[PDB]
Design a protein around this motif. Structure first.
Motif, PDB file in Angstrom:
ATOM      1  N   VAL A 113       0.838  -1.193   0.000  1.00 41.11           N
ATOM      2  CA  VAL A 113       0.000   0.000   0.000  1.00 41.11           C
ATOM      3  C   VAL A 113       0.875   1.246   0.000  1.00 41.11           C
ATOM      4  N   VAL A 114       0.499   2.213  -0.839  1.00 40.89           N
ATOM      5  CA  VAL A 114       1.032   3.569  -0.806  1.00 40.89           C
ATOM      6  C   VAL A 114      -0.139   4.527  -0.988  1.00 40.89           C
ATOM      7  N   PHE A 115       0.130   5.812  -0.784  1.00 39.20           N
ATOM      8  CA  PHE A 115      -0.883   6.849  -0.912  1.00 39.20           C
ATOM      9  C   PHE A 115      -0.612   7.702  -2.142  1.00 39.20           C
ATOM     10  N   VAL A 116      -1.684   8.068  -2.844  1.00 39.45           N
ATOM     11  CA  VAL A 116      -1.625   8.993  -3.966  1.00 39.45           C
ATOM     12  C   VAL A 116      -2.705  10.048  -3.765  1.00 39.45           C
ATOM     13  N   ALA A 117      -2.660  11.080  -4.613  1.00 41.70           N
ATOM     14  CA  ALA A 117      -3.530  12.239  -4.432  1.00 41.70           C
ATOM     15  C   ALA A 117      -5.002  11.842  -4.441  1.00 41.70           C
ATOM     16  N   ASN A 118      -5.429  11.103  -5.459  1.00 38.89           N
ATOM     17  CA  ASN A 118      -6.836  10.743  -5.587  1.00 38.89           C
ATOM     18  C   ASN A 118      -6.954   9.524  -6.493  1.00 38.89           C
ATOM     19  N   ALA A 119      -8.195   9.069  -6.685  1.00 40.13           N
ATOM     20  CA  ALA A 119      -8.439   7.888  -7.507  1.00 40.13           C
ATOM     21  C   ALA A 119      -8.074   8.142  -8.963  1.00 40.13           C
ATOM     22  N   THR A 120      -8.317   9.360  -9.453  1.00 40.73           N
ATOM     23  CA  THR A 120      -7.933   9.696 -10.820  1.00 40.73           C
ATOM     24  C   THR A 120      -6.426   9.587 -11.005  1.00 40.73           C
ATOM     25  N   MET A 121      -5.659  10.071 -10.032  1.00 42.31           N
ATOM     26  CA  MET A 121      -4.205   9.990 -10.075  1.00 42.31           C
ATOM     27  C   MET A 121      -3.737   8.539 -10.090  1.00 42.31           C
ATOM     28  N   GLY A 122      -4.385   7.708  -9.270  1.00 47.37           N
ATOM     29  CA  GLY A 122      -4.001   6.308  -9.197  1.00 47.37           C
ATOM     30  C   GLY A 122      -4.300   5.546 -10.474  1.00 47.37           C
ATOM     31  N   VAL A 123      -5.491   5.749 -11.041  1.00 46.30           N
ATOM     32  CA  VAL A 123      -5.839   5.081 -12.293  1.00 46.30           C
ATOM     33  C   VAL A 123      -4.933   5.563 -13.420  1.00 46.30           C
ATOM     34  N   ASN A 124      -4.594   6.855 -13.420  1.00 48.93           N
ATOM     35  CA  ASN A 124      -3.623   7.359 -14.386  1.00 48.93           C
ATOM     36  C   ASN A 124      -2.255   6.726 -14.168  1.00 48.93           C
ATOM     37  N   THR A 125      -1.895   6.466 -12.909  1.00 47.57           N
ATOM     38  CA  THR A 125      -0.606   5.844 -12.623  1.00 47.57           C
ATOM     39  C   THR A 125      -0.519   4.449 -13.235  1.00 47.57           C
ATOM     40  N   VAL A 126      -1.637   3.724 -13.267  1.00 48.73           N
ATOM     41  CA  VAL A 126      -1.637   2.384 -13.848  1.00 48.73           C
ATOM     42  C   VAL A 126      -1.545   2.462 -15.368  1.00 48.73           C
ATOM     43  N   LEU A 127      -2.498   3.159 -15.993  1.00 49.36           N
ATOM     44  CA  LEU A 127      -2.590   3.153 -17.450  1.00 49.36           C
ATOM     45  C   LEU A 127      -1.387   3.818 -18.108  1.00 49.36           C
ATOM     46  N   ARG A 128      -0.792   4.823 -17.462  1.00 51.25           N
ATOM     47  CA  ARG A 128       0.368   5.494 -18.039  1.00 51.25           C
ATOM     48  C   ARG A 128       1.655   4.696 -17.880  1.00 51.25           C
ATOM     49  N   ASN A 129       1.686   3.715 -16.977  1.00 49.69           N
ATOM     50  CA  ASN A 129       2.887   2.920 -16.754  1.00 49.69           C
ATOM     51  C   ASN A 129       2.910   1.612 -17.532  1.00 49.69           C
ATOM     52  N   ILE A 130       1.751   1.107 -17.964  1.00 47.83           N
ATOM     53  CA  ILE A 130       1.709  -0.183 -18.642  1.00 47.83           C
ATOM     54  C   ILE A 130       2.479  -0.106 -19.952  1.00 47.83           C
ATOM     55  N   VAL A 131       3.362  -1.076 -20.167  1.00 47.92           N
ATOM     56  CA  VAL A 131       4.070  -1.237 -21.431  1.00 47.92           C
ATOM     57  C   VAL A 131       3.295  -2.247 -22.264  1.00 47.92           C
ATOM     58  N   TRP A 132       2.771  -1.800 -23.398  1.00 51.12           N
ATOM     59  CA  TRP A 132       1.887  -2.624 -24.207  1.00 51.12           C
ATOM     60  C   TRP A 132       2.688  -3.486 -25.179  1.00 51.12           C
ATOM     61  N   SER A 133       2.036  -4.535 -25.675  1.00 55.45           N
ATOM     62  CA  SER A 133       2.709  -5.500 -26.535  1.00 55.45           C
ATOM     63  C   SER A 133       3.192  -4.836 -27.818  1.00 55.45           C
TER      64      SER A 133
END
Lengths: 436, 445
Positions: A79-99
């Motif tokens: 567990v870590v803390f981020v600003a909000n749910a939008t920030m967290g969902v952006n953290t996932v989708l912006r970090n994924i390396v796609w095929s």
């Protein structure tokens, strides 16, 4: 001893006495005890800025991480803390390396939170089409089996078009309408099809059991400020250790980034200068809820219960119905949706065929022309704020408006009666064309 | 009726621990008591009526802060919005830029770049998969302005000789470590002549130095209000000229305001660019709201920006020169006297580090001459004494002084402010001298 719930608990909060908070699920609020904690953290931050902000921030971050990880029954290492749910969902989708073949697809439902859905749109634009998205439409009230079947068919068809379903955005409780989503079944299917389960649990912690270890999701995000009595701007970011390496950079990229206590946890401690006082308060709100109130299980029980009966009373007063399926699984949270006693005229550019049940439920009801639907929408929002000193969000779904009410430990049955009588008068005035 | 005098008498207006001596305002800043009350006043309004206030008063209070900060900067109000911090704004720039399809674009930056911003370049290179690269320009301090400009011209010219295309430049207004005024006016003008995006990191900027935005006309500018404008922490102003606003496709993070590519009715309202930054995820926007209150407090109570800036810069030089005199060393300054054109100063500590033969540094004669006779610390122990000086300064002396390790020397960075005066820098010299005497005796261990 723990306090009784209801309007007597308003003594513990700092809401305007003339205002009635029927929409806690949108921005939340904090009790007086936590507001004083918040300002205490800021005072210490301004007393000795560098000594406190450099070296006491990680101590206070860990104390809130430990308290919330124990609430979720997960390892503190996840567990870590981020600003909000939008920030967290952006953290996932912006970090994924796609095929590299460009066949990856992001699966999501048309009830997705607007900001999240627009994050998928931008990520596709930013990656230059290396990834695409598949939107799954949902009709509410939605049976849980029909949601699963809609997900399985979208998986099947994605492969039939030569695409690879890579990641799915899954709600714990959806935003509009506010309904419990069958996320347990969807995440399990994501395991079987090797799909990254990105669980948007913004409407989650403090309200419903997240079942994290049981469901074992790839990523989970949840707003502490929504239903955990945590100051505004605080979401808990859950990542199992197996997936922490996929989060290459925080958002934004800061000192903790490593170009090509664990490194993943340390990366989130300083991500640019912010007021971390909401994060520090997490440990206090959890203890406040357990010591001052009966605890997590007693809190959630009262709210979900009040949500079912309160909405049912609002439905009786309005002469309509709450939003619920045959298995009674939509209202498994503190929010409930009640249909308003009118109907919107059909839109010629996008006509919506109604089921027999839906068209039966609208005869005898006043009909608003579709060209005036948005005009009536604004009028109801303004009047509820200015004349009634409240706010009620409304979901426009299949020629009908569904008002979303949020139960809370400081509300009781009389509050939903007031909401029922308020909306009733409001819709009578809409029937008389007062919105023009 | 006159503005309040500067110095320690002004501390009663701030909320610093009287036992704590704040010589490092430039890291996190602080706010006066009146502004902290404004912050909490906006908090109370947020909890009194959450939805009515956070939905409909947020854009109003943002617009008042945008108009107030735009007039201070003397720019059109449509060219400024508010983001979380400087580390958020530079990221907003570097992540929206669309790089040339041929893969020849490269980002040019100086080795004094802020650590988070430099690694933001590294990640965006990784995220965008080699279609953009970076070229680091090493700087030796004290650096003459012509030499900085020269190294920038040489890196641009060189850049094209490897078949690359210099596309964007990260430019400081005032660099972080060491805290020195950068010749950004020349570099931004060179970027226009060479058709390079000027991404100006002016985090050490607003409230301290004249940004000269209209004169500079940079492509993108960022600056922390919470550093030197007495704004609560979590506030940076994002300047983009209208000609470049279409390049910011998505805010950070992406939110309701993003428009996917591929009808309108905007009327004559707020632009889409400005609207996009109003709601980018749920946060406490109280720091953003206080920008108009901080600017007004500085004008009414302290007499305005020019008087505030002029005192702090004058105190920086003279205060830094006394610290150098007490220590018997020097301030970080070049022949042109343009490094100390801000409220921060760097003073060399009266010792030298042993040379590291892993990266041996070839010193000038002026570094040979100025280190002759000084106690030398072995290079094994440089980092050991570095941490020990930090702990002692906080535990024994109740202060904090950040230090740059540059060319076998430590330069302590001090920050002047309106609540400080000449006696504070005398205390800094006395403290740092007592500290360095104990380092020479090897007390660190």
């Amino acid at each position: 001893g723990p306090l009784p719930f209801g309007n007597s608990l308003l003594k513990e909060f700092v809401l305007d006495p003339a205002y009635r908070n029927l929409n806690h699920g949108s921005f939340g609020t904090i009790p007086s005890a936590i507001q004083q904690k918040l300002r205490s953290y800021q005072t210490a931050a301004e007393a000795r800025p560098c000594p406190f902000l450099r070296y006491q921030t990680p101590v206070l971050l860990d104390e809130s991480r430990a308290a919330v990880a124990n609430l979720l029954k997960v390892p503190v290492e996840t567990v870590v803390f981020v600003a909000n749910a939008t920030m967290g969902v952006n953290t996932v989708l912006r970090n994924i390396v796609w095929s590299a073949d460009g066949k990856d697809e992001i699966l999501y439902f048309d009830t997705i939170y607007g900001a999240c859905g627009k994050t998928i749109d931008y990520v596709i634009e930013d990656k230059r089409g290396i990834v695409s998205s598949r939107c799954i439409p949902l009709i509410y009230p939605a049976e849980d089996d029909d949601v699963v079947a809609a997900f399985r068919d979208a998986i099947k068809k994605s492969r039939e078009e030569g695409k690879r379903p890579r990641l799915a955005v899954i709600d714990v409780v959806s935003s509009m309408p506010g309904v419990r989503f069958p996320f347990e079944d969807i995440v399990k299917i994501c395991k079987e099809e090797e799909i990254i389960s990105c669980v948007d649990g913004a409407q989650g912690i403090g309200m419903v059991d997240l079942k994290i270890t049981e469901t074992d999701p790839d990523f989970l995000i949840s707003n502490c400020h929504k239903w955990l009595f945590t100051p505004r701007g605080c979401a808990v970011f859950y990542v199992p250790v197996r997936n922490q390496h996929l989060i290459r950079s925080t958002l934004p990229t800061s000192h903790g980034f490593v170009p090509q206590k664990s490194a993943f946890v340390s990366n989130f401690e300083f991500v640019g200068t912010v007021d971390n006082s909401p994060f520090f308060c997490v440990k206090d709100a959890i203890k406040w809820r357990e010591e001052v109130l009966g605890g997590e299980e007693r809190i959630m029980e009262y709210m979900t219960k009040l949500a079912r009966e309160g909405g049912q009373k609002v439905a009786e007063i309005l002469g309509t119905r709450v939003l619920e399926n045959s298995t009674g699984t939509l209202i498994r949270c503190a929010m409930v949706n009640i249909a308003l006693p009118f109907v919107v005229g059909e839109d010629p550019k996008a006509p919506v065929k109604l089921t027999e049940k839906e068209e039966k439920d609208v005869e005898g009801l006043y009909e608003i022309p579709h060209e005036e639907a948005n005009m009536a929408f604004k009028w109801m929002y303004n009047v509820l704020q200015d004349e009634f000193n409240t706010f009620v969000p409304m979901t426009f779904h299949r020629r009908r408006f569904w008002a979303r009410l949020s139960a809370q430990v400081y509300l009781e049955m009389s509050d939903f009666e007031w909401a029922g009588k308020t909306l009733k008068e409001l819709c009578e005035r809409v029937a008389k064309g007062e919105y023009k």
